[PDB]
Design a binder for these strands. Structure first.
Ligand SMILES: [Cl-]
Ligand SMILES: [Cl-]
Ligand SMILES: [Cl-]
Ligand SMILES: [Cl-]
Lengths: 309, 309
DNA sequence: CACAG
DNA sequence: CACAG
């Protein structure tokens, strides 16, 4: 996942109200722009800090690649000098209560500014350009200054999108793989959604939500332990590579906010706000031994899915 | 009539789309602002040049005095530092095709900038403040640069409003004047709209539109020659102080785009675009002698109403 | 160049 | 001060 800084002093209200970013494809004189070319590097799930009137107003999530689109008519005079041939990105804005003023924090972030194409000068004034790459270390510092609301956009939210993208591509690869038969293709695709032979096989091993004890099939998700995307075809359909979980527990486990020790002890991520466990009446403690086959997968989950600092 | 310059780079689209001007009543620190206090001097009919992104985008007509109003919610971050307690004016925007860039013309307008509270610096850069008085000589120069569309907002349009305001006040004075009887009050008020005993008396003198020859009562306006606002009570009800005119001819005569010599020769103002007379098939020439009584009033019209350079 | 200053 | 720069 990448971080971006979009400078929107001229058109923030129009871009926010329309849920987009927009730039020309080239400078007015027809020359290439590093900044406009950055539009073509943004991926769905990338986090975009909106900077306008000296403040960071939004921690946004990109929901498209750049697509060819005319300059928005609603820019009017404020956009007069930009070419009509442009790039648009669908940006899911998340307005923040703590609108940080980066110049007021320049001593804290200066060491983390990139040597080239920095969104800020060494004195903390913004540079006049549209879209800048933000190094991960600089992004961390900005998130520290904004507080919890910035972390809430990123962890188990923005950072899930690239995983979904990867899984979508694998689903395409399976559907076109000549080495596997039609039934296998169908069962592998269903297993991604906890359906088909995977669910029936899991039901021979597990009977309830580990955490909430619910037994009712219509209130349980068939979750993989080793994620579907990184499982091989045998592991994708293995009844021992799953748990039946209530939907909120599925959410916490799938995103690595929780995991389990081999003996069933729940492990809670530092990225899980404990006020979530209180609100949903989920206790820390022991949720029963796992089988040797389940433990092999749970080891993978602890080492690769579970969120650690 | 006064001219104003409103600098709207931060909020032009919101002010244009809402048909308003807005400022705080005081600076953020509670101190008086000359610029915000200018809001309380604007009169209906005053002309306001909108300046944004270095261009004059509108020649507007004020349609209210300033009224106490909260800062528009649609300003958002762009208006964050302004106090919520403000002044609003209803401004009738007229967008111009020729968006002049004053800095590109600074040699032409510099000699006409006021010594104090100028909207422009001597180098042609704008001053950072909201609302500036524009001297009449500076306004003329700006109108010369914009062209016909600016003149069209002012002459026989914006500059009629203060006349209507004056006439409204006189109507109030008449309605409250203890020296005249109820019938007189009614007849004086009706006469302003070409109704009542004035119309009946005019119909004993005139029978047709001087210019178009229409005789049909339902297609004729009873127009004063010496305007109702500056006529005394005898002159307001005098059948010899009027003409029956087709509505377009009433428009041209009432606003002083045309007048007449005592012998009936039509006089055409330099402020009348001749393409109006062509479009409406109105010929220059002679429209019949006026009576001695009518000539006394027509002298007043030529000397005071007729538009001369 | 140039969505900030 | 500060609706531009
Ligand atoms: Cl495209
Ligand atoms: Cl620098
Ligand atoms: Cl008021
Ligand atoms: Cl100066």
């Amino acid at each position: 996942m990448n971080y971006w800084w979009v400078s929107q002093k001229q058109t923030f209200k129009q871009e926010f109200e329309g849920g987009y970013m927009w730039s020309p494809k080239e400078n007015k004189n027809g020359t290439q722009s590093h900044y406009y070319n950055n539009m073509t590097l943004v991926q769905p799930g990338d986090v975009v800090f909106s900077f306008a009137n000296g403040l960071i107003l939004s921690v946004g999530i990109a929901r498209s690649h750049a697509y060819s689109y005319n300059k928005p008519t609603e820019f009017g005079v404020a956009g007069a000098d930009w070419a009509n041939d442009g790039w648009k990105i669908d940006l899911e804005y998340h307005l923040v209560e703590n609108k940080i003023r980066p110049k007021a924090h320049i001593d804290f972030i200066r060491p983390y500014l990139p040597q080239k194409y920095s969104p800020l000068q060494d004195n903390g004034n913004g540079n006049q350009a549209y879209l800048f790459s933000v190094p991960h270390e600089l992004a961390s510092k900005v998130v520290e200054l904004i507080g919890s609301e910035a972390e809430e956009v990123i962890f188990g939210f923005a950072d899930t999108t690239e995983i979904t993208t990867t899984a979508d591509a694998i689903e395409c690869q399976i559907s076109n793989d000549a080495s596997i038969d039609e039934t296998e293709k169908h069962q592998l695709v269903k297993s991604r959604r906890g359906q088909g032979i995977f669910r029936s096989r899991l039901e021979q091993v597990e009977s309830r939500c580990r955490v909430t004890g619910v037994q009712l099939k219509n209130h349980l998700i068939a979750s993989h332990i080793k994620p579907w995307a990184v499982s091989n075809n045998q592991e994708r359909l293995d009844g021992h590579n799953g748990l039946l979980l209530a939907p909120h527990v599925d959410h916490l486990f799938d995103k690595g906010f929780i995991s389990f020790e081999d003996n069933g002890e729940m492990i809670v991520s530092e990225k899980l706000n404990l006020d979530v466990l209180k609100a949903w009446s989920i206790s820390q403690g022991n949720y029963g031994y796992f089988s040797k086959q389940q433990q092999e997968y749970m080891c993978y989950h602890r080492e690769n899915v579970f969120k650690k600092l």
